[PDB]
């Protein structure tokens, strides 16, 4: 369920450089990636 | 002329390049530029 | 030693480098000047 978290970051500028990262908006990497959906899970549950 | 002209831009403008970065670390709270940063060493230095 | 020390390694520590920088330039700027006054001089004592 972490993962599936649309976790938000912002806009930083990386040390001893001039870029500057675009911010992270609702970022469920378990969902955003198409996991969720491929998978029909938000976790993993295996029995063998 | 032109090279003197060229140097001295190369350098004001290696300043600025200098002074944009921000800086993060975990031990110091908050996030930090290049010219707060220098200022917190000096006079942590100085002290110690 | 102590009043010499404490400067100097706050100097090591990069909290210098817009000072020195600038100064960096102005004595740039004066090697060009002596560069264009000798070029004047070999121009005025040619060796035709």
Same mark, same amino acid.
């Given at each position: 369920d972490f993962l599936n978290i649309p976790? /938000?970051? !912002?806009?930083?500028? $990386? !040390?001893?450089? =001039? =870029? /500057? /990262? !675009? !911010? +992270?908006?609702?970022?469920? $990497?378990?969902?955003? /990636?198409? +996991?969720?959906?491929?998978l029909k899970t938000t976790k993993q549950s295996f029995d063998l | 002329q032109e090279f003197h002209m060229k140097v001295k831009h190369l350098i004001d403008s290696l300043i600025d390049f200098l002074n944009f970065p921000r800086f993060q670390f975990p031990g110091k709270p908050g996030i930090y530029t290049r010219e707060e940063l220098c200022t917190m060493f000096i006079r942590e230095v100085g002290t110690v | 030693l102590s009043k010499e020390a404490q400067e100097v390694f706050k100097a090591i520590q990069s909290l210098k *480098? *817009?000072?020195? @920088?600038?100064?960096? &330039?102005? @004595? @740039?700027?004066?090697?060009? &000047? @002596?560069?264009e006054d000798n070029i004047k001089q070999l121009k005025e004592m040619k060796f035709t």
């Open positions: 976790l /938000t970051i !912002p806009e930083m500028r $990386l !040390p001893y450089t =001039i =870029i /500057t /990262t !675009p !911010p +992270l908006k609702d970022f469920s $990497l378990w969902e955003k /990636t198409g +996991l969720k959906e491929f | - | *480098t *817009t000072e020195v @920088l600038r100064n960096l &330039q102005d @004595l @740039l700027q004066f090697i060009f &000047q @002596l560069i």
